[PDB]
Design a protein around this nucleic acid. Sequence first.
DNA 1: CCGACGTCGCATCAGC
DNA 2: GCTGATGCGA
DNA 3: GTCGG
Length: 326
Amino acid sequence: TLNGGITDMLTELANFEKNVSQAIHKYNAYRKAASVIAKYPHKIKSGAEAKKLPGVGTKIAEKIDEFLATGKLRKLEKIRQDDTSSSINFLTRVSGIGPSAARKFVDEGIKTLEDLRKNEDKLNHHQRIGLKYFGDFEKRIPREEMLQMQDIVLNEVKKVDSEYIATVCGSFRRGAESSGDMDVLLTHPSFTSESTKQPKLLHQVVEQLQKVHFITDTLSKGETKFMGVCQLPSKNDEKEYPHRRIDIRLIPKDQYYCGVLYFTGSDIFNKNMRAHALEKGFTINEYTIRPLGVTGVAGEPLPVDSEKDIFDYIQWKYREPKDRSE
DNA sequence: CCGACGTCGCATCAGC
DNA sequence: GCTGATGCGA
DNA sequence: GTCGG
Ligand SMILES: Nc1ccn([C@H]2C[C@H](O)[C@@H](COP(=O)(O)NP(=O)(O)OP(=O)(O)O)O2)c(=O)n1
Ligand SMILES: [Mn+2]
Ligand SMILES: [Mn+2]
Ligand code: NA
Ligand code: NA
């Protein structure tokens, strides 16, 4: 955590540009700068030293010099003191409320937690559930709890159909001692890139999880992706566990490796790897890796038999999940 | 300089 | 209702 | 905000 002060500053600047300025590429630029500094193994002593890193340019180098010298950034100081930015920034912390809805709400004089509770009628379903569990969703999940959750999910899925395979991905698969949520990759032999031989494959799994009162709420739900809320069972006289975010992703079984690569992350690792893939003349999604044709159009899917095969195509040394925490 | 910046799913809305 | 764009999110 | 070509 050598440069925590610097990475915190950049992250706050990223959130500002995303939530307030609605400038997603500035948000990404700061996300990237924060990431490359985060894994830089020296305590940074100047902006010039920082500017050597890819993604760190002049402006950020200048900001790092201010931060090192003073321990603050006047730019951030002002943003903090500002009514509207602070309100918009806060509202986006509710799941389902983004930059657009947040700014629209603030315009209407809705800018506090109290205001949201008072105006629940103005929320779409996602946002209402997000407000309901605002407190809970602030809390992180200890890996021990994640292990309990894994046991329930894997066993309940087994009970539906023994041919399901459920794989917990995200920060958990990367070995994090705590997680923001739980991500579950799901496969079933009936669903491949070639055919879907059974309907409601994801539905049946969700339904079962609701039945045992594990899944408590639904944010969104389609044929291949579920976003919702779950909770561990507590014992007698035990205070209940916090409600947790969970999302589930049904991937065609023959495309498991691209799927698990995607869902393991991190988000920035995925961006770095896909950017590199493009440089090498391939494109990668959660389904396939395709070569790019000489006019830039994606071609047929390439054979994939392991995560490492995808790494091999773009000439990257294989990296274990725990080294993908970028 | 300066266009281009990872790829896609589900909810909602605009237009017909 | 459908098609495509936008919002929010993985 | 950054950068490659
Ligand atoms: N922008 C994003 C967000 C997520 N993802 C993929 C990579 C993530 O590791 C995986 C799960 O998303 P996530 O749950 O938001 N983040 P993740 O599990 O990495 O870390 P946590 O904050 O949940 O601990 O989805 C992505 O490819 N692009
Ligand atoms: Mn996660
Ligand atoms: Mn998730
Ligand atoms: Na740089
Ligand atoms: Na939000």
